Amino acid sequence: TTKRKPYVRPMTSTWWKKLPFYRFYMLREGTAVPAVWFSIELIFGLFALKNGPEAWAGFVDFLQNPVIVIINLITLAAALLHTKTWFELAPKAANIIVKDEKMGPEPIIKSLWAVTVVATIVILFVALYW
Amino acid sequence: MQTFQADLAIVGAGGAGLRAAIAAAQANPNAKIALISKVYPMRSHTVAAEGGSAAVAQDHDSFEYHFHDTVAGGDWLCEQDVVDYFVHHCPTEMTQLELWGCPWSRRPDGSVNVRRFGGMKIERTWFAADKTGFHMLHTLFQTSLQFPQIQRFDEHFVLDILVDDGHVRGLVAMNMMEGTLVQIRANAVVMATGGAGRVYRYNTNGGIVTGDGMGMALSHGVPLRDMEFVQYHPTGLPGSGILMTEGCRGEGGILVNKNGYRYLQDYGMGPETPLGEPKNKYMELGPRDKVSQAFWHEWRKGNTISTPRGDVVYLDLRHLGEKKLHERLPFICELAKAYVGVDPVKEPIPVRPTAHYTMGGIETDQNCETRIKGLFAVGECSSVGLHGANRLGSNSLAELVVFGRLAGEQATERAATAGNGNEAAIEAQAAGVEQRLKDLVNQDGGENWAKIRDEMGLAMEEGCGIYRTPELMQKTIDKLAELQERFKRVRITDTSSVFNTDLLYTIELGHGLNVAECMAHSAMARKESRGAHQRLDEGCTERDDVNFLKHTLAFRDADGTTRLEYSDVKITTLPPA
Amino acid sequence: AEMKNLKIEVVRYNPEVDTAPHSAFYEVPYDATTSLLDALGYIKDNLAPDLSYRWSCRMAICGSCGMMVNNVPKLACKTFLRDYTDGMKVEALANFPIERDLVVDMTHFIESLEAIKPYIIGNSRTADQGTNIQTPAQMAKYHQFSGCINCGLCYAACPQFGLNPEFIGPAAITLAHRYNEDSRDHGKKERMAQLNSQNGVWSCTFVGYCSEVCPKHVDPAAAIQQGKVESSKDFLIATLKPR
Amino acid sequence: MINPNPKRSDEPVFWGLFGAGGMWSAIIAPVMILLVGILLPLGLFPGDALSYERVLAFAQSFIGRVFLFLMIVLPLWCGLHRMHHAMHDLKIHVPAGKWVFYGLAAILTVVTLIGVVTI
Ligand SMILES: Cc1cc2nc3c(=O)[nH]c(=O)nc-3n(C[C@H](O)[C@H](O)[C@H](O)COP(=O)(O)OP(=O)(O)OC[C@H]3O[C@@H](n4cnc5c(N)ncnc54)[C@H](O)[C@@H]3O)c2cc1C
Ligand SMILES: O=C([O-])CC(=O)C(=O)O
Ligand code: SF4
Ligand code: F3S
Ligand code: FES
């Protein structure tokens, strides 16, 4: 018969709305939804692409819808946020010691970001120039 | 109450206690060990140390050099056969710590680096960055988890110890969360409760440091030894008393007055040494005693700067530069930035001499055993005979691991050949502790425990400071006697059972008051100036091996009076002139 | 010069009396120096002696001041009143059961920390032989992770520990990682049990907030992630064992 | 106590894929959303570069066949994995999520793998 009543605070399904850190984390995690959406869109593309000129031209018409464009514009910003954030976090998986000091993360963050840029170009160059 | 069976009980989970707990679980794998602490072990004040631990390591060093550095450092009030034991067991203990995973800072060759502390000629202070204490305790605590034989009573406040027929038989302690009394019956008991600096208003110590272990020893007619010796640290922040390590001055930092004059040269510590080159024992690396004293001398001249928090001198570290700053002393930067709002690269730091270490403590013999058989005291709450009249910088942590080991080992021997005490007589002891506690709870008188506390701090700081006169010593003895009376009129308003701090802080205050009276009387009586004890009055300004080459023993009688006795100081290889 | 006075909201709870925690208000005089701890002292000293809280070191090295200030895990002695002129609310450390006033049940923490075997293992060296050799480079591996003072702020900050109180937690995982990456230690295999658990590293979604709150700049989030990499290695190297 | 003998979580496999999918998507997703999402449908590209004929030509080639696979597959495993814990984060309970999401991922993976071998 302890005299203590340990009071436990509940945790609401909305714990995250309070602190802006939690909000960002949620929103960052939230980048997945469009990231998956794009992959769906690509399946449509891939599939309608196999079904000859008629299907594909109708698929490009689907992307031509004013809303879908807006949606895709959001999807780009989404995946851009994901990239920005992802790169800030990837280095923290690495534990490299240089000259008796734990390194990171800026050298990695930059390295990675560069690779993104070189890709962006090479791809845009391949896709458009020929 | 709920009674627990243990083979031995240790009060305190600081460096000392933990080293004892570990030692005993190794010395005997089968015993049940009760480790008791009023905070979770990692909170013990040992956690706050920065400078490091002394142990003989360099090839040009010798145990004799470390022996002679300590004895002279304690003004020959050292028990020399204890120092010899101490010096020799240091390198084993620091090595053993390293083996348990203490992150000692290293030479690039992978061997452990050392630096210099407490004006020692040959550098022997092993250090983990500037957080040596945090590392030691966290390594010591973490290590201890591997031994099941240690059962921990975390956040249990020990009220009294159980004694019958001149032998210890256990202790009574409150379960701090439940607020429920518990008997621990141990046939040998170790006191690892640490120092009692907190009885001073301005000090470097954590809250836990209230001297309860000393208070309990007092109550059973065990003398406190060499109590008047309270070590001040030259450089503490004003009004918080937070420690700025010697490391600062060891990295060649400077102390200046309102004129920005590096005054230490005028106090026998000339000549001034160029900023880059900091020579040991000269200026800011000079002898602790004189440095602390130098502040007082400067204070009367109107040379000391005046701030809302107090009169200060400046620890200018600007000239150090951020490269060595953040590598060697990074933690110091953080404190200055936060607690006094001073950026140590841009600005100078206010420092004031501050109460830091209790050379005094529970009288023990070379095995850490007290006048009471089975009862041991180890670490700061003890007086082993190691520090004498003044501790040597970086020797305290070392003491913990050296004698913590011994105390754990020694108490195992005693408990294993103790036999059984009078059960009826023992249980009747616990009844009293319980009743005595209740008597305090009921006690009415509408006196605030906190204001009595506040006043005791002031009396100590003014009457038992770096420089001591009879008048002010007396004033303090008087004031304490007054406060002892007022304590009997304290009324504890919180009568709750669940983690009642009001009650606990008040108990702590009780010990505080008793112990303070030990410090105060001891000081008044010692008519000489040795070590930390510096009297200004005529005929007491100098050291006296003629009349005062002896240990001060302070007893507390049942009538509540502090009676003093004196004991000889044992010498081996190094007598004075 | 009469010091500025400040209204402070402090959430009290007494198990004997109170059904549920309720706020209380205290007016404390403060200056540029006054830390919340300082203020908390004044309360018990002058206004509410019945107040109970955890403190000791006073220099933010012991770790006991764990409490929430305005929905942020903070140290009571590293929290400064001047910074809260707009208003200030003080509940006990989050994600732990409140025993009394600002004191919380810390058992789970201690238990977690214990479960990961945080001590040098399997090193057969002895003290008479001399210390182990470890380079500055070899220390760098775990050194930062070794600086945890056990405040438990990480636990109040991490939302996953909120949702799952069986999650062994940032601090406790970090400490495991610290011993893993110490060259002196050969017990990695003993710790992986707890780490590989669903309640181990894998309860962490990398919210990373623990690292933000860490008073001692330990960055436990990094430990947890390097932990994930390490656990995965072990998951593979375990699956590839036909034996 | 805490569980002395805890089950090894089977999560490493899923986190692994998420790790690669996160990494792929991170680098190569933006440009693609630009190409397929914006440039193609708005006609903002030179001549016949993203015309039916040329796309097909690329998609059918082996290099393209592999690329399209990964560009669809990897972002799913990353994405769905993230959503799975988001359910738990929102305190919303979904029966056999573990099977639901990774199932969906496997399903789509299969559908994708079929697509890139010509339907
Ligand atoms: C800021 C600072 C820096 C220092 N730096 C150094 C240094 O660099 N080198 C060096 O050698 N020395 C240093 N010292 C001195 C040295 O750290 C101490 O002398 C030493 O840590 C004392 O440890 P201890 O084991 O005696 O007890 P402590 O570490 O003080 O622990 C005491 C224990 O007793 C328990 N306790 C107390 N009262 C009760 C009670 N009533 N009931 C139950 N339990 C109780 C406590 O909970 C605690 O666990 C420093 C001191 C300070 C203040
Ligand atoms: O005084 C000591 O023994 C060592 C100390 O606290 C310091 O780092 O200055
Ligand atoms: S990691 Fe930081 S937050 Fe967490 S307990 Fe350790 S010191 Fe406190
Ligand atoms: S906040 Fe919690 S989710 Fe992981 S990154 Fe820190 S442990
Ligand atoms: S008081 Fe020791 S952590 Fe803040």
mmCIF file with all atom_site columns, N, CA and C in Angstrom, chain B residues 308-355:
data_model
loop_
_atom_site.group_PDB
_atom_site.id
_atom_site.type_symbol
_atom_site.label_atom_id
_atom_site.label_alt_id
_atom_site.label_comp_id
_atom_site.label_asym_id
_atom_site.label_entity_id
_atom_site.label_seq_id
_atom_site.pdbx_PDB_ins_code
_atom_site.Cartn_x
_atom_site.Cartn_y
_atom_site.Cartn_z
_atom_site.occupancy
_atom_site.B_iso_or_equiv
_atom_site.pdbx_formal_charge
_atom_site.auth_seq_id
_atom_site.auth_comp_id
_atom_site.auth_asym_id
_atom_site.auth_atom_id
_atom_site.pdbx_PDB_model_num
ATOM 1   N N  . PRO B 1 308 ? 27.887 43.486 -8.571  1.00 0.00 ? 308 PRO B N  1
ATOM 2   C CA . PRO B 1 308 ? 26.663 43.113 -7.856  1.00 0.00 ? 308 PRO B CA 1
ATOM 3   C C  . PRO B 1 308 ? 26.743 41.773 -7.111  1.00 0.00 ? 308 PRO B C  1
ATOM 4   N N  . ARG B 1 309 ? 27.438 40.797 -7.697  1.00 0.00 ? 309 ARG B N  1
ATOM 5   C CA . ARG B 1 309 ? 27.604 39.476 -7.087  1.00 0.00 ? 309 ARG B CA 1
ATOM 6   C C  . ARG B 1 309 ? 28.675 39.446 -5.999  1.00 0.00 ? 309 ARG B C  1
ATOM 7   N N  . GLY B 1 310 ? 29.612 40.389 -6.072  1.00 0.00 ? 310 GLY B N  1
ATOM 8   C CA . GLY B 1 310 ? 30.665 40.520 -5.069  1.00 0.00 ? 310 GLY B CA 1
ATOM 9   C C  . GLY B 1 310 ? 31.915 41.188 -5.603  1.00 0.00 ? 310 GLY B C  1
ATOM 10  N N  . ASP B 1 311 ? 32.887 41.393 -4.722  1.00 0.00 ? 311 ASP B N  1
ATOM 11  C CA . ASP B 1 311 ? 34.185 41.901 -5.137  1.00 0.00 ? 311 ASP B CA 1
ATOM 12  C C  . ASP B 1 311 ? 34.977 40.791 -5.809  1.00 0.00 ? 311 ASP B C  1
ATOM 13  N N  . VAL B 1 312 ? 35.520 41.094 -6.981  1.00 0.00 ? 312 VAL B N  1
ATOM 14  C CA . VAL B 1 312 ? 36.148 40.082 -7.826  1.00 0.00 ? 312 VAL B CA 1
ATOM 15  C C  . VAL B 1 312 ? 37.544 40.470 -8.286  1.00 0.00 ? 312 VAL B C  1
ATOM 16  N N  . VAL B 1 313 ? 38.294 39.483 -8.763  1.00 0.00 ? 313 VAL B N  1
ATOM 17  C CA . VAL B 1 313 ? 39.471 39.735 -9.589  1.00 0.00 ? 313 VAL B CA 1
ATOM 18  C C  . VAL B 1 313 ? 39.253 39.059 -10.944 1.00 0.00 ? 313 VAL B C  1
ATOM 19  N N  . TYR B 1 314 ? 39.970 39.516 -11.972 1.00 0.00 ? 314 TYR B N  1
ATOM 20  C CA . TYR B 1 314 ? 39.766 39.015 -13.335 1.00 0.00 ? 314 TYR B CA 1
ATOM 21  C C  . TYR B 1 314 ? 40.716 37.885 -13.749 1.00 0.00 ? 314 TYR B C  1
ATOM 22  N N  . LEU B 1 315 ? 40.133 36.768 -14.177 1.00 0.00 ? 315 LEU B N  1
ATOM 23  C CA . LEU B 1 315 ? 40.888 35.690 -14.800 1.00 0.00 ? 315 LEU B CA 1
ATOM 24  C C  . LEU B 1 315 ? 40.852 35.905 -16.304 1.00 0.00 ? 315 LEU B C  1
ATOM 25  N N  . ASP B 1 316 ? 41.844 36.634 -16.806 1.00 0.00 ? 316 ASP B N  1
ATOM 26  C CA . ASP B 1 316 ? 41.919 36.972 -18.220 1.00 0.00 ? 316 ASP B CA 1
ATOM 27  C C  . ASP B 1 316 ? 42.531 35.812 -18.985 1.00 0.00 ? 316 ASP B C  1
ATOM 28  N N  . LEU B 1 317 ? 41.756 35.280 -19.920 1.00 0.00 ? 317 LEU B N  1
ATOM 29  C CA . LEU B 1 317 ? 42.181 34.142 -20.719 1.00 0.00 ? 317 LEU B CA 1
ATOM 30  C C  . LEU B 1 317 ? 42.221 34.497 -22.203 1.00 0.00 ? 317 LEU B C  1
ATOM 31  N N  . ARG B 1 318 ? 41.872 35.743 -22.518 1.00 0.00 ? 318 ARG B N  1
ATOM 32  C CA . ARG B 1 318 ? 41.852 36.235 -23.893 1.00 0.00 ? 318 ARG B CA 1
ATOM 33  C C  . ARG B 1 318 ? 43.091 35.815 -24.673 1.00 0.00 ? 318 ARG B C  1
ATOM 34  N N  . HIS B 1 319 ? 44.256 35.993 -24.059 1.00 0.00 ? 319 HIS B N  1
ATOM 35  C CA . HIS B 1 319 ? 45.541 35.736 -24.704 1.00 0.00 ? 319 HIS B CA 1
ATOM 36  C C  . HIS B 1 319 ? 45.798 34.255 -25.005 1.00 0.00 ? 319 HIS B C  1
ATOM 37  N N  . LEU B 1 320 ? 44.896 33.384 -24.563 1.00 0.00 ? 320 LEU B N  1
ATOM 38  C CA . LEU B 1 320 ? 45.031 31.952 -24.819 1.00 0.00 ? 320 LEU B CA 1
ATOM 39  C C  . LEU B 1 320 ? 44.723 31.546 -26.260 1.00 0.00 ? 320 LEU B C  1
ATOM 40  N N  . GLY B 1 321 ? 43.720 32.173 -26.874 1.00 0.00 ? 321 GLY B N  1
ATOM 41  C CA . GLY B 1 321 ? 43.337 31.854 -28.253 1.00 0.00 ? 321 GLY B CA 1
ATOM 42  C C  . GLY B 1 321 ? 42.517 30.581 -28.387 1.00 0.00 ? 321 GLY B C  1
ATOM 43  N N  . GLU B 1 322 ? 41.547 30.611 -29.297 1.00 0.00 ? 322 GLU B N  1
ATOM 44  C CA . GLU B 1 322 ? 40.511 29.575 -29.406 1.00 0.00 ? 322 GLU B CA 1
ATOM 45  C C  . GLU B 1 322 ? 40.997 28.162 -29.737 1.00 0.00 ? 322 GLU B C  1
ATOM 46  N N  . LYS B 1 323 ? 42.171 28.059 -30.354 1.00 0.00 ? 323 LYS B N  1
ATOM 47  C CA . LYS B 1 323 ? 42.716 26.772 -30.805 1.00 0.00 ? 323 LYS B CA 1
ATOM 48  C C  . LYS B 1 323 ? 43.022 25.824 -29.640 1.00 0.00 ? 323 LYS B C  1
ATOM 49  N N  . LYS B 1 324 ? 43.780 26.313 -28.660 1.00 0.00 ? 324 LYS B N  1
ATOM 50  C CA . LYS B 1 324 ? 44.088 25.542 -27.457 1.00 0.00 ? 324 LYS B CA 1
ATOM 51  C C  . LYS B 1 324 ? 42.945 25.594 -26.455 1.00 0.00 ? 324 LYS B C  1
ATOM 52  N N  . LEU B 1 325 ? 42.188 26.690 -26.475 1.00 0.00 ? 325 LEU B N  1
ATOM 53  C CA . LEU B 1 325 ? 41.020 26.830 -25.612 1.00 0.00 ? 325 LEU B CA 1
ATOM 54  C C  . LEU B 1 325 ? 40.096 25.627 -25.764 1.00 0.00 ? 325 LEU B C  1
ATOM 55  N N  . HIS B 1 326 ? 39.550 25.450 -26.962 1.00 0.00 ? 326 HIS B N  1
ATOM 56  C CA . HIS B 1 326 ? 38.525 24.439 -27.215 1.00 0.00 ? 326 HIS B CA 1
ATOM 57  C C  . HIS B 1 326 ? 39.024 22.996 -27.179 1.00 0.00 ? 326 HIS B C  1
ATOM 58  N N  . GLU B 1 327 ? 40.329 22.827 -27.350 1.00 0.00 ? 327 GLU B N  1
ATOM 59  C CA . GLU B 1 327 ? 40.958 21.518 -27.280 1.00 0.00 ? 327 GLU B CA 1
ATOM 60  C C  . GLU B 1 327 ? 41.189 21.094 -25.833 1.00 0.00 ? 327 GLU B C  1
ATOM 61  N N  . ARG B 1 328 ? 41.693 22.023 -25.026 1.00 0.00 ? 328 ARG B N  1
ATOM 62  C CA . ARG B 1 328 ? 42.149 21.710 -23.672 1.00 0.00 ? 328 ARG B CA 1
ATOM 63  C C  . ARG B 1 328 ? 41.139 22.078 -22.590 1.00 0.00 ? 328 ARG B C  1
ATOM 64  N N  . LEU B 1 329 ? 40.550 23.268 -22.716 1.00 0.00 ? 329 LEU B N  1
ATOM 65  C CA . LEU B 1 329 ? 39.561 23.769 -21.759 1.00 0.00 ? 329 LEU B CA 1
ATOM 66  C C  . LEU B 1 329 ? 38.302 24.215 -22.495 1.00 0.00 ? 329 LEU B C  1
ATOM 67  N N  . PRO B 1 330 ? 37.398 23.265 -22.800 1.00 0.00 ? 330 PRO B N  1
ATOM 68  C CA . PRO B 1 330 ? 36.210 23.677 -23.543 1.00 0.00 ? 330 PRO B CA 1
ATOM 69  C C  . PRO B 1 330 ? 35.024 23.918 -22.625 1.00 0.00 ? 330 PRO B C  1
ATOM 70  N N  . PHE B 1 331 ? 34.929 23.114 -21.567 1.00 0.00 ? 331 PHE B N  1
ATOM 71  C CA . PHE B 1 331 ? 33.821 23.144 -20.618 1.00 0.00 ? 331 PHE B CA 1
ATOM 72  C C  . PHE B 1 331 ? 33.803 24.477 -19.876 1.00 0.00 ? 331 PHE B C  1
ATOM 73  N N  . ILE B 1 332 ? 34.986 24.924 -19.466 1.00 0.00 ? 332 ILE B N  1
ATOM 74  C CA . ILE B 1 332 ? 35.171 26.216 -18.804 1.00 0.00 ? 332 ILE B CA 1
ATOM 75  C C  . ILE B 1 332 ? 34.562 27.360 -19.613 1.00 0.00 ? 332 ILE B C  1
ATOM 76  N N  . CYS B 1 333 ? 34.708 27.287 -20.932 1.00 0.00 ? 333 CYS B N  1
ATOM 77  C CA . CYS B 1 333 ? 34.134 28.281 -21.828 1.00 0.00 ? 333 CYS B CA 1
ATOM 78  C C  . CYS B 1 333 ? 32.620 28.357 -21.662 1.00 0.00 ? 333 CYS B C  1
ATOM 79  N N  . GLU B 1 334 ? 31.979 27.190 -21.611 1.00 0.00 ? 334 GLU B N  1
ATOM 80  C CA . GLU B 1 334 ? 30.521 27.096 -21.542 1.00 0.00 ? 334 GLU B CA 1
ATOM 81  C C  . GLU B 1 334 ? 29.969 27.740 -20.285 1.00 0.00 ? 334 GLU B C  1
ATOM 82  N N  . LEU B 1 335 ? 30.601 27.439 -19.151 1.00 0.00 ? 335 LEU B N  1
ATOM 83  C CA . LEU B 1 335 ? 30.177 27.955 -17.849 1.00 0.00 ? 335 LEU B CA 1
ATOM 84  C C  . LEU B 1 335 ? 30.240 29.479 -17.839 1.00 0.00 ? 335 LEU B C  1
ATOM 85  N N  . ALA B 1 336 ? 31.425 30.013 -18.120 1.00 0.00 ? 336 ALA B N  1
ATOM 86  C CA . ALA B 1 336 ? 31.635 31.451 -18.196 1.00 0.00 ? 336 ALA B CA 1
ATOM 87  C C  . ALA B 1 336 ? 30.557 32.121 -19.035 1.00 0.00 ? 336 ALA B C  1
ATOM 88  N N  . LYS B 1 337 ? 30.305 31.556 -20.216 1.00 0.00 ? 337 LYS B N  1
ATOM 89  C CA . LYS B 1 337 ? 29.285 32.057 -21.139 1.00 0.00 ? 337 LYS B CA 1
ATOM 90  C C  . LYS B 1 337 ? 27.903 32.104 -20.492 1.00 0.00 ? 337 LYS B C  1
ATOM 91  N N  . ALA B 1 338 ? 27.576 31.063 -19.728 1.00 0.00 ? 338 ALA B N  1
ATOM 92  C CA . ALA B 1 338 ? 26.250 30.930 -19.136 1.00 0.00 ? 338 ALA B CA 1
ATOM 93  C C  . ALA B 1 338 ? 26.099 31.575 -17.759 1.00 0.00 ? 338 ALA B C  1
ATOM 94  N N  . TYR B 1 339 ? 26.962 31.201 -16.822 1.00 0.00 ? 339 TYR B N  1
ATOM 95  C CA . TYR B 1 339 ? 26.764 31.567 -15.420 1.00 0.00 ? 339 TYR B CA 1
ATOM 96  C C  . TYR B 1 339 ? 27.212 32.969 -15.030 1.00 0.00 ? 339 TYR B C  1
ATOM 97  N N  . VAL B 1 340 ? 28.205 33.508 -15.731 1.00 0.00 ? 340 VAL B N  1
ATOM 98  C CA . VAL B 1 340 ? 28.617 34.901 -15.522 1.00 0.00 ? 340 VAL B CA 1
ATOM 99  C C  . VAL B 1 340 ? 28.495 35.736 -16.798 1.00 0.00 ? 340 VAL B C  1
ATOM 100 N N  . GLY B 1 341 ? 28.065 35.088 -17.879 1.00 0.00 ? 341 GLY B N  1
ATOM 101 C CA . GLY B 1 341 ? 27.826 35.755 -19.160 1.00 0.00 ? 341 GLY B CA 1
ATOM 102 C C  . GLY B 1 341 ? 29.079 36.298 -19.821 1.00 0.00 ? 341 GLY B C  1
ATOM 103 N N  . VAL B 1 342 ? 30.202 35.622 -19.608 1.00 0.00 ? 342 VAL B N  1
ATOM 104 C CA . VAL B 1 342 ? 31.489 36.102 -20.089 1.00 0.00 ? 342 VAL B CA 1
ATOM 105 C C  . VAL B 1 342 ? 32.085 35.149 -21.113 1.00 0.00 ? 342 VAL B C  1
ATOM 106 N N  . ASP B 1 343 ? 32.330 35.675 -22.309 1.00 0.00 ? 343 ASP B N  1
ATOM 107 C CA . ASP B 1 343 ? 32.966 34.920 -23.382 1.00 0.00 ? 343 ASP B CA 1
ATOM 108 C C  . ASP B 1 343 ? 34.492 34.941 -23.190 1.00 0.00 ? 343 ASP B C  1
ATOM 109 N N  . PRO B 1 344 ? 35.089 33.780 -22.854 1.00 0.00 ? 344 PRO B N  1
ATOM 110 C CA . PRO B 1 344 ? 36.490 33.720 -22.421 1.00 0.00 ? 344 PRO B CA 1
ATOM 111 C C  . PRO B 1 344 ? 37.533 34.059 -23.492 1.00 0.00 ? 344 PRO B C  1
ATOM 112 N N  . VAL B 1 345 ? 37.096 34.327 -24.720 1.00 0.00 ? 345 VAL B N  1
ATOM 113 C CA . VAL B 1 345 ? 38.008 34.761 -25.786 1.00 0.00 ? 345 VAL B CA 1
ATOM 114 C C  . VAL B 1 345 ? 37.919 36.269 -25.999 1.00 0.00 ? 345 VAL B C  1
ATOM 115 N N  . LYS B 1 346 ? 36.760 36.830 -25.669 1.00 0.00 ? 346 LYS B N  1
ATOM 116 C CA . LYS B 1 346 ? 36.495 38.259 -25.827 1.00 0.00 ? 346 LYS B CA 1
ATOM 117 C C  . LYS B 1 346 ? 36.648 39.040 -24.514 1.00 0.00 ? 346 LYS B C  1
ATOM 118 N N  . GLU B 1 347 ? 36.342 38.389 -23.397 1.00 0.00 ? 347 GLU B N  1
ATOM 119 C CA . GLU B 1 347 ? 36.161 39.096 -22.137 1.00 0.00 ? 347 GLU B CA 1
ATOM 120 C C  . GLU B 1 347 ? 36.945 38.450 -20.979 1.00 0.00 ? 347 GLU B C  1
ATOM 121 N N  . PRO B 1 348 ? 37.162 39.200 -19.877 1.00 0.00 ? 348 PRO B N  1
ATOM 122 C CA . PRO B 1 348 ? 37.770 38.592 -18.695 1.00 0.00 ? 348 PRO B CA 1
ATOM 123 C C  . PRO B 1 348 ? 36.744 38.061 -17.688 1.00 0.00 ? 348 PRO B C  1
ATOM 124 N N  . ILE B 1 349 ? 37.129 37.001 -16.975 1.00 0.00 ? 349 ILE B N  1
ATOM 125 C CA . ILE B 1 349 ? 36.243 36.262 -16.067 1.00 0.00 ? 349 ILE B CA 1
ATOM 126 C C  . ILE B 1 349 ? 36.407 36.678 -14.597 1.00 0.00 ? 349 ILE B C  1
ATOM 127 N N  . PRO B 1 350 ? 35.290 37.032 -13.926 1.00 0.00 ? 350 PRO B N  1
ATOM 128 C CA . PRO B 1 350 ? 35.352 37.364 -12.511 1.00 0.00 ? 350 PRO B CA 1
ATOM 129 C C  . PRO B 1 350 ? 35.547 36.108 -11.671 1.00 0.00 ? 350 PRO B C  1
ATOM 130 N N  . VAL B 1 351 ? 36.599 36.097 -10.859 1.00 0.00 ? 351 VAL B N  1
ATOM 131 C CA . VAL B 1 351 ? 36.856 34.989 -9.937  1.00 0.00 ? 351 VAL B CA 1
ATOM 132 C C  . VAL B 1 351 ? 37.125 35.479 -8.514  1.00 0.00 ? 351 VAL B C  1
ATOM 133 N N  . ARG B 1 352 ? 36.658 34.703 -7.544  1.00 0.00 ? 352 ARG B N  1
ATOM 134 C CA . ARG B 1 352 ? 36.744 35.033 -6.130  1.00 0.00 ? 352 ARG B CA 1
ATOM 135 C C  . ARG B 1 352 ? 37.118 33.730 -5.422  1.00 0.00 ? 352 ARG B C  1
ATOM 136 N N  . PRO B 1 353 ? 38.048 33.778 -4.451  1.00 0.00 ? 353 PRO B N  1
ATOM 137 C CA . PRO B 1 353 ? 38.385 32.570 -3.696  1.00 0.00 ? 353 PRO B CA 1
ATOM 138 C C  . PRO B 1 353 ? 37.149 31.976 -3.029  1.00 0.00 ? 353 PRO B C  1
ATOM 139 N N  . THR B 1 354 ? 36.998 30.662 -3.147  1.00 0.00 ? 354 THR B N  1
ATOM 140 C CA . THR B 1 354 ? 35.744 30.000 -2.839  1.00 0.00 ? 354 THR B CA 1
ATOM 141 C C  . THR B 1 354 ? 35.982 28.685 -2.100  1.00 0.00 ? 354 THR B C  1
ATOM 142 N N  . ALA B 1 355 ? 35.117 28.384 -1.131  1.00 0.00 ? 355 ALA B N  1
ATOM 143 C CA . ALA B 1 355 ? 35.225 27.163 -0.328  1.00 0.00 ? 355 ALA B CA 1
ATOM 144 C C  . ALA B 1 355 ? 35.049 25.880 -1.149  1.00 0.00 ? 355 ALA B C  1
#
